[PDB]
Design a protein around this ligand. Structure first.
Ligand SMILES: Nc1ncnc2c1ncn2[C@@H]1O[C@H](COP(=O)(O)OP(=O)(O)OP(=O)(O)O)[C@@H](O)[C@H]1O
Ligand SMILES: Nc1ncnc2c1ncn2[C@@H]1O[C@H](COP(=O)(O)OP(=O)(O)OP(=O)(O)O)[C@@H](O)[C@H]1O
Ligand SMILES: [Mg+2]
Ligand SMILES: [Mg+2]
Lengths: 360, 360
């Protein structure tokens, strides 16, 4: 007569329990190697050998209870066998795992990915990019931030009238203007998580897409990259229905219904990005599926001035005006990425980038 | 009650442990044959019979502590069973393996390859090609060397402003000018390692590409050969999205996001090479993905003079000028490979190659 808690692979606290188990690896006869390396120079690579508990029946001594944990071997199922019928040590283990895991993810953003029909973490948590480090047009980031915050902070007004509690944004522009960087900065600012989804995968179908959109982690953003490339449209639409033009078991109607249909879930934010706004079917970007669409374009006077004052802090304000005037006179259209590269050429050299502005 | 260290196939020190195990092959009842052969002449091939320890349970007598090693058998795993609970002998074994392995790789370059979704070594370490042995245009190798060194030696400046710590270079030119040779010479000079990646493989997908680009070995270079051949573009781009045109499950957007997106890693250098600069999509070679693009072309006066003074050391300087003048007068465009071949015809024969210069 014991208690045999079973936690299979498909659990939200799976990573939390794994992290706690790596924390409590002491007094474990079976082990797995946990060595990492950090090269410095001269062929002297630092060694960091440690001990991940192997998928075995290691006996743990938490609170003096001789708790037995077994991880099997691609189907995985972790087991926490104990004595008697208490269930309190389970509460304590889950709480300690939560305290340890959330401590690790502090000041960072967690990136998930679509594995099969489920979300799994993708590498270590990444350092968040400061929002002010990305410079957009005047009064553009503020509008998006305010709209997202207003959507988050007003759930009651949605339910009191019956509108589904959903939202979606679309960003389009020339390549190299700040779409992905702004998305990353916004995710860092809002303390959310990014879920990467590809519409051209070979293991995606309508039912799997619906399940993925239904089981997305809470306090997270869903990102769709290059929606245009997954469906040729427009000129085709005038003759025949929208074909797939990709590798996968997906259809246009399935995606349209999954984004906003009858079975769509609630409290979800979706971001989509494209480079050709004119290649998207009108039914896909109608209100209800894409509430706000914004255009990010080439550089301007204020954007160039802000970028200059950001890359060379402490300089006089006249230098930024000189740089902006010279850049806008020498060339008409220019991308922020090219400006960033040109600045990267002249590292810590103000008044040097204000002379060699020949980048035609 | 023992300690059972488990090191599976997917480990960095796997090769180090294998090399140490081949070093400590003494006192091993089970063996595998280690014969190598070196032909000289007259059907007399020198034998080098030795003993690789077979994948068995050989008992080792390191430090007088009876250690029971075991390699199983696709799926491969190595086990180091010991006595008691000490963990010191594991540290000593790892340190000795590091000392032995790094001793072997001295003055050479290690070439990795993409097996499945992991990097594995490809043959014995190769002898490094001296940097000066590759002659490029005046002030071209120095610029690239300085830029790479500056990127390596300034990680703080990247972090203090938020730019991702990444870089990428592109080399393009006519076939037979020194792209791959210069890449090899630079890798030898910088004491890095080369990782070969093919975009046309049949076992490559977006997730696998991202995982490979994330787990690349430290102090290494990532090489992409003939990026143009993996994606037809330009004239197609004016009508329809970029097709893949190959054998494999890869997409243009997937490669674009993997090279520089949201989930891209840090501290990575990527080299790409092509022969048709006009067949590359503009979005692929924008700044942020290709920080520096350089053109290697046909021979010039200084290049020919340096090549002549390199292939025939000790000759008077007037002979180099005579050879350069005659070559540039008899022909307008010529590749360094053709000059190397023409010199190879006249081995150790200066003043002979300055007469038979008819290679129209
Ligand atoms: N507005 C901006 N402010 C600062 N840096 C920027 C800006 N736009 C782009 N960059 C920089 O340029 C590089 C590429 O930016 P990013 O990937 O966000 O461009 P993008 O518009 O998403 O391009 P693509 O459409 O090809 O994905 C990064 O180094 C990024 O930091
Ligand atoms: N600049 C050079 N100096 C010395 N040898 C050179 C030079 N360029 C080419 N060679 C020699 O020519 C041969 C081919 O060189 P390499 O493979 O680097 O050319 P490549 O430009 O990479 O050609 P491809 O585009 O076909 O790969 C080698 O023997 C190489 O040593
Ligand atoms: Mg992007
Ligand atoms: Mg080559």
């Amino acid at each position: 007569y014991m208690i045999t808690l079973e936690v299979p692979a498909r659990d939200r606290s799976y990573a939390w329990l794994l992290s706690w188990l790596t924390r409590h690896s002491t007094r474990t006869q079976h082990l797995s190697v946990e060595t990492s390396y950090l090269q410095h120079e001269s062929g002297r690579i630092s060694t960091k050998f440690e001990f991940i508990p192997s998928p075995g029946n290691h006996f743990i001594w938490y609170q003096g209870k001789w708790i037995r944990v077994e991880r099997n071997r691609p189907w995985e199922s972790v087991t926490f066998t104990a004595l008697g019928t208490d269930r309190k040590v389970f509460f304590n283990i889950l709480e300690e795992a939560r305290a340890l895991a959330l401590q690790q993810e502090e000041g960072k953003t967690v990136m998930y990915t679509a594995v099969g029909s489920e979300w799994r973490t993708f590498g270590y948590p990444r350092r968040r990019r400061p929002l002010d480090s990305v410079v957009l047009q005047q009064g553009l980031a503020d509008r998006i931030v305010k709209d997202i915050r207003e959507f988050i902070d007003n759930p009651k007004w949605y339910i009191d009238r019956g509108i589904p509690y959903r939202r979606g944004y679309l960003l389009y522009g020339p390549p190299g203007c700040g779409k992905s960087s702004f998305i990353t900065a916004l995710a860092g600012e809002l303390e959310h998580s990014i879920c990467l989804l590809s519409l051209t995968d070979s293991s995606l179908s309508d039912d799997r897409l619906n399940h993925l959109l239904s089981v997305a982690p809470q306090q997270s953003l869903v990102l769709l990259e290059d929606v245009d490339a997954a469906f040729l449209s427009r000129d085709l639409a005038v003759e025949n229905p929208i074909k797939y033009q990709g590798l996968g078991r997906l259809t246009f109607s399935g995606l349209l219904n999954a984004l906003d249909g009858v079975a769509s879930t609630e409290a979800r934010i979706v971001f989509m990005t494209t480079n050709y706004i004119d290649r998207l079917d009108p039914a896909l970007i109608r209100p209800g599926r894409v509430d706000l669409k914004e255009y990010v374009g080439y550089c301007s006077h204020w954007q160039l001035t802000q970028m200059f004052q950001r890359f060379y802090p402490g300089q006089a304000p006249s230098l930024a005006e000189n740089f902006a005037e010279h850049v806008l006179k020498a060339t008409s259209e220019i991308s922020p990425a090219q400006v960033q590269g040109y600045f990267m050429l002249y590292k810590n050299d103000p008044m040097g980038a204000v002379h060699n502005i020949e980048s035609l």
